[PDB]
Design an enzyme around this catalytic site. Structure first.
Site, short mmCIF file in Angstrom:
data_model
loop_
_atom_site.label_atom_id
_atom_site.label_comp_id
_atom_site.label_asym_id
_atom_site.label_seq_id
_atom_site.Cartn_x
_atom_site.Cartn_y
_atom_site.Cartn_z
N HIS B 94 0.83 -1.19 0.00
CA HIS B 94 0.00 0.00 0.00
C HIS B 94 0.88 1.26 0.00
CE1 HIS B 94 -3.02 3.03 1.03
NE2 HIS B 94 -3.89 2.17 0.52
N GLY B 170 -6.91 9.85 -1.11
CA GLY B 170 -7.48 10.75 -0.12
C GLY B 170 -7.54 12.22 -0.48
N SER B 210 -9.30 7.95 -4.54
CA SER B 210 -10.43 8.89 -4.47
C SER B 210 -11.64 8.41 -5.27
CB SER B 210 -9.99 10.31 -4.89
OG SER B 210 -9.06 10.87 -3.98
#
Lengths: 247, 247
Positions: B94, B170, B210
């Site tokens: 990640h 984000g 997003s």
């Protein structure tokens, strides 16, 4: 007045529900010295299970956490989560976080600030590498490390300093009693000159690094060794003998 | 033959038992497209809880793990532990592991080899930083990252590639459908020339960064976007709409 003897059991990355269930069951049944403050650091994935199964009188420590209560930090857990499952401790700055996973002093300090402000107790870990020891800068390094912690501690009543020299962890090469005493004495001296007399007298400085039932009696008897951070042996029945180091 | 649409919700460091419990109840009850393979990556401290509460038709991913089943790795969890609480997935590489916690390609590659050997499915994440994007080396980077994964994959049937550019996580600044299609298309090309046609045609490449209820429909309709890795919105009711991107 006298500092309560303290032994933390860092299970590290070990066990499953079956084997940890057996470990806990043995601990819950053992004749433990009432004098001793015991805390068990469970893998994060088993922390909830660990708190359910362990006797309330034994505390539960997360093996790490992060520095805010929530956020985009995949893989991290926060004190709020640790409190949420009923544990009241986190181990911070462990040798493995610093030297395997690169956690800096600034990050550890922030973690310490956060966990304390969230109402957790902290086992703050410090320690010098072998090369730093033979270079002569043991003091310089542990003091720097202790300071970075200390800058973020308003209330020392819930902190336990844990001295674990890297070359003694998991190696079967523990400090002699004399060596541990020397470094512990110096740290307590640090606390006394940089924080206060009261905090120096009241704060537990525990020794980590290849502690066994065979070597713990003599380490415990030292004036400034207040107990133990125990790794490998914390998975074994001799953890009981370590809880009972004095007796 | 056609690749199954796949949606993973990475909850990151969010939630307690009350609130995840509400998130799970909502999810359990939602009309979800039977077409969609859904997986939820819970914080490690809540993994066991999430697997208990989530419907067995929804998978559970750890948000990370380490590369051996057990050892002196404070703060770490292993595939054996993840399997032990009944979860079948781990998210690896990640953006947050790589860029906040400094996890390398070499390390991520070892984690992938281990998790797969232990019988977990892996969501392997890749992605370029903004500065790499404008330097015109997006290709080079994701290729390098994909290679480091691919060198440790003998059986692609349990892997999902996740392309999540750092600047999109984000930020409310997602790839346009066109931008994700472009990169996805190139990743699929890589797989074809470097692994095999069959692996290229069968391996899911999901997009992350997003993704919302508002933008998912058009991203999903791109030829080489097989689904989503969803952070922020995975904590919300629109995660359902994303699971239902196609219908």
């Amino acid at each position: 007045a006298p500092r309560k003897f303290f032994v933390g059991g860092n299970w590290k990355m070990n066990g499953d529900k079956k084997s940890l269930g057996e470990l806990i069951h043995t601990l819950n049944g053992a004749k433990l010295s009432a004098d001793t403050e015991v805390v068990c650091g469970a893998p994060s994935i088993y922390l909830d299970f660990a708190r359910q199964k362990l006797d309330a009188k034994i505390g539960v420590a997360a093996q790490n956490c992060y520095k805010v209560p929530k956020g985009a930090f995949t893989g991290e857990i926060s004190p709020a989560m640790i409190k949420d499952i009923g544990a009241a401790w986190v181990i911070l700055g462990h040798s493995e976080r610093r030297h395997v996973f690169g956690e800096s002093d600034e990050l550890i300090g922030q973690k310490v600030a956060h966990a304390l402000a969230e109402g957790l107790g902290v086992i703050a870990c410090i320690g010098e590498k072998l090369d730093e020891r033979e270079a002569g800068i043991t003091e310089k390094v542990v003091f720097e490390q202790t300071k970075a912690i200390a800058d973020n501690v308003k209330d020392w009543s819930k902190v336990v300093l844990a001295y674990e020299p890297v070359w003694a962890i998991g190696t079967g090469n523990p400090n002699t009693p004399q060596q541990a005493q020397e470094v512990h004495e110096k740290l307590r001296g640090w606390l006394k000159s940089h924080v206060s007399d009261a905090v120096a007298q009241s704060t537990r400085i525990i020794y980590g690094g290849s502690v066994t039932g065979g070597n713990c009696k003599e380490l415990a008897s030292q004036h400034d060794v207040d107990g133990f951070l125990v790794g490998g042996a914390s998975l074994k029945p001799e953890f009981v003998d370590i809880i009972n180091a004095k007796h």
